[PDB]
Ligand binder design. Sequence first.
Ligand SMILES: O=C(O)CC1=NCN=C1
Ligand SMILES: [Zn+2]
Length: 414
Amino acid sequence: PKQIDTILINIGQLLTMESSGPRAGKSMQDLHVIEDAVVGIHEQKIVFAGQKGAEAGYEADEIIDCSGRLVTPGLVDPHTHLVFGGSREKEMNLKLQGISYLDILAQGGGILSTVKDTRAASEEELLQKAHFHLQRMLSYGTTTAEVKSGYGLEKETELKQLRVAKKLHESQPVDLVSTFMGAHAIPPEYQNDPDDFLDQMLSLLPEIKEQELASFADIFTETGVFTVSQSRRYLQKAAEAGFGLKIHADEIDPLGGAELAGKLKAVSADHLVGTSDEGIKKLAEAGTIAVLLPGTTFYLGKSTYARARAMIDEGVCVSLATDFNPGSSPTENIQLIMSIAALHLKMTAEEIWHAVTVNAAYAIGKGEEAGQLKAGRSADLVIWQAPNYMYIPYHYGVNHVHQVMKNGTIVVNR
Ligand SMILES: O=C(O)CC1=NCN=C1
Ligand SMILES: [Zn+2]
């Protein structure tokens, strides 16, 4: 019967992002915009979302007047390292002094610095710290996010990070996708035996699988870290073990991480700053989603961003993320990422919106559950303090959120 819980009326602009799959190449530009719209919600799910009139015959218990505001699905942040101990502010001077990201790491700092902190922090402290950051992420519009482990580089801590991720997911509104990234860096105890280290991380997959602590396996394929050869062997093992594949590829040096991702049919390849044309073609060919992290580029103090236009021109499905982490991108503001995407990745507003909703969702195996406002989907949406979708990435560095809804309930009210 047409008796539902909630209905949003007088929506100035509604972006349903309705799609039948990830958006690649030209389809990323095809943004469907509905003026003067409405959204019907019942039992935490979307009943209807479209032109004014669709609410005809319906009786709702709660009518939300959006005052001509912009409404879109809740945002998806497909790549973060949410759970971590300590912070790296004391490393700012090293970067200012011109020491490269990799040289800091080779010095025993960077990821290895955060590893010490994360290993030392209690499970309760990590949970408390992550809740704060995750709620801030929520306040900026993120209702679904991917979170990677990778600051343990040992059985105890990696497992602790995954358990924390599980707690967070079950104790607050943001839905989380967990990724095991024990292969983030080479810990001191394995400096001269990286392959053995990788095997130790692989030995953790069975129990991680049994306890459902992670759905994907990631790795940092980079100079001074893991080679393409080691990454292939590791990822193939991960796939046999039943995990989806992700990879931090061609972030700094052009090693061919992208090509490997495509060959292994990874769900996504992330960073891709130094990816070759062959890598771009391989990504498009395999349907591997290219998750760009313009925040990390900007934060590293660099001027060369990933070649997003070339990727889109070549048929790649592009996505974006904060890469929220203490070392190279300490920001929860996915909206700023949208702005950076426009100004430095040279993406259009349309492409950007598809990037943080539909493509972000598919990049983490949630293509059928998030990023779209259509019948059956969980009622996850954002009512913005803006009249149109171009305004969001246009006005930068702030929070444009008016209200955030998760499962049909307002969880953020500004
Ligand atoms: O530096 C960090 O903590 C995070 C990072 N991993 C790979 N690139 C950046
Ligand atoms: Zn990352």
